[PDB]
């Protein structure tokens, strides 16, 4: 398994872009030497417009290996309008610099549909019980899902969320899951599903409400 | 997406002057990018002529600076080139084009069909 | 002014064969770990398409099979394999130092 460095540059979550109004783009670099020099991380845009200061944060790793990211803001409306930014990686040791460029990404638009369901009890679990969300047939693949008991939202390190999956039709699809406990649902047995994405109209907002026992 | 359309090109007579125009849409030009006039010469190659960035800054080619003119109205989202003293070395197609930023440098990623100017008495 | 030379002024290449044009600069057009050379299609008729900015680097939508190499003033564009509809002539152009100046462009003919 030989280390090979690489970077990456995700886009806004549909979150931090509807909800907070506060997007950001973060650069990833993986695959560093910590006993190496470090890397010289820059910022561009196609528009030439000056970037904003960006905050750096680099970690130690398990397996050995530094990690290096780079998380700039960016305006709302640059990026929706469909600005382009780039992340250039430099490093002594690198042969050629690396540069990885992110936008808006384009396509047909559709919104998402929820489905919220919550397991029966298991033996054993008697205090335990796991909701799931299914949520479907939205494009483009950028989503993002959030649960709330109780009108407030939860941590996200309390739910699951995998990977945009691609639909036999032209959609995608994403799974949520969440584990809960009989302090919650006795409290107020109503969670909430709720998914942000640009296609929902209005607000990039569409929501599901579920109970154990209904 | 951006769309560049030029026009104002035609026949002009030698000695005289020139005014074309780049109505852009579906982008603001003072919002960014860097915005180019380049022409063709017939069976020859791409001269690059003059350049206005969103803030105003505006640079020329020393082929022709001194008759020529890079200049925008903002209400119109149009930019134009204004050529005076024409010879009919100057007949060419002129293309206008968005130039897009990297690292301190532009690249012209964005094209109009181009408009001929034809230089003859 | 950076003068740039392509070559070959012409060649005539069969579908699926590689292509490969070279542009050299009368100066270096290297700054900051990157060379700004950029390349350029003009098919008939129509406006120079770019293809490749700053050396190497894939504009949005462009196939796959155009690359770009080099540095300082040495610089390839690549067809790794030639298709009828890259009948066109391929421009360099150097955005280091202004004013900005282009290749005097390569003939690609398809051979059939």
């Known amino acids: 398994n030989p280390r090979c460095v690489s970077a990456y540059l995700s886009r806004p979550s549909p979150f931090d872009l509807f909800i907070r109004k506060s997007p950001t783009i973060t650069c990833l670099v993986v695959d560093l030497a910590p006993s190496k020099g470090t890397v010289n991380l820059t910022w561009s845009r196609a528009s030439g417009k000056p970037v904003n200061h960006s905050t750096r944060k680099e970690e130690k790793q398990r397996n050995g290996t530094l990690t290096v990211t780079s998380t700039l803001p960016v305006g709302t409306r640059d990026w929706i309008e469909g600005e382009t930014y780039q992340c250039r990686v430099t490093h002594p040791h690198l042969p050629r610099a690396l540069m990885r460029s992110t936008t808006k990404t384009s396509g047909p638009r559709a919104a998402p549909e929820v489905y919220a369901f919550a397991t029966p009890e298991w033996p054993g679990s008697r205090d335990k019980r796991t909701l799931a969300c299914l949520i479907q047939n939205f494009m483009p693949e950028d989503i993002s899902v959030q649960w709330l008991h109780n009108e407030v939202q939860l941590p996200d390190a309390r739910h699951s969320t995998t990977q945009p999956r691609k639909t036999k039709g032209s959609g995608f699809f994403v799974f949520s899951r969440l584990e809960v406990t009989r302090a919650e649902w006795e409290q107020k047995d109503e969670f909430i599903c709720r998914a942000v994405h640009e296609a929902a109209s209005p607000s990039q907002t569409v929501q599901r409400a579920v109970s154990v026992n209904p | 997406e951006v769309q560049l359309v030029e026009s104002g090109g035609g026949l002009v007579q030698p000695g005289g002057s020139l005014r074309l125009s780049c109505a852009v849409s579906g982008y603001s030009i003072t919002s960014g990018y860097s915005w180019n006039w380049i022409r063709q010469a017939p069976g020859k190659g791409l001269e690059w002529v003059a350049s206005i960035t969103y803030d105003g800054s505006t640079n020329y080619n020393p082929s022709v600076k001194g008759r020529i003119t890079i200049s925008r109205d903002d209400s119109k989202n149009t930019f134009y080139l204004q050529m005076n003293s024409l010879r009919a070395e100057d007949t060419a197609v002129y293309y206008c084009?968005?130039?897009?930023?990297?690292?301190?440098?532009?690249?012209?990623?964005?094209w109009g069909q181009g408009t001929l100017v034809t230089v003859s008495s | 002014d950076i003068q740039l030379t392509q070559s070959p002024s012409s060649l005539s290449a069969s579908v699926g064969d590689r292509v490969t044009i070279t542009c050299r600069a009368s100066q270096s057009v290297d700054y900051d770990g990157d060379s700004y050379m950029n390349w350029y299609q003009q098919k008939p008729g129509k406006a120079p398409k770019l293809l490749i900015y700053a050396a190497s680097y894939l504009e949005s939508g462009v196939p796959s099979r155009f690359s770009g190499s080099g540095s300082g003033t040495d610089f390839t564009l690549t067809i790794s394999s030639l298709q009828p509809e890259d009948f066109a002539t391929y421009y360099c152009?150097?955005?280091?130092?202004?004013?900005?100046?282009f290749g005097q462009g390569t003939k690609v003919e398809i051979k059939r």
């Open positions: 152009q150097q955005s280091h130092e202004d004013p900005y100046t």
């Open positions: 084009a968005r130039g897009s930023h990297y690292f301190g440098h532009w690249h012209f990623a964005v």
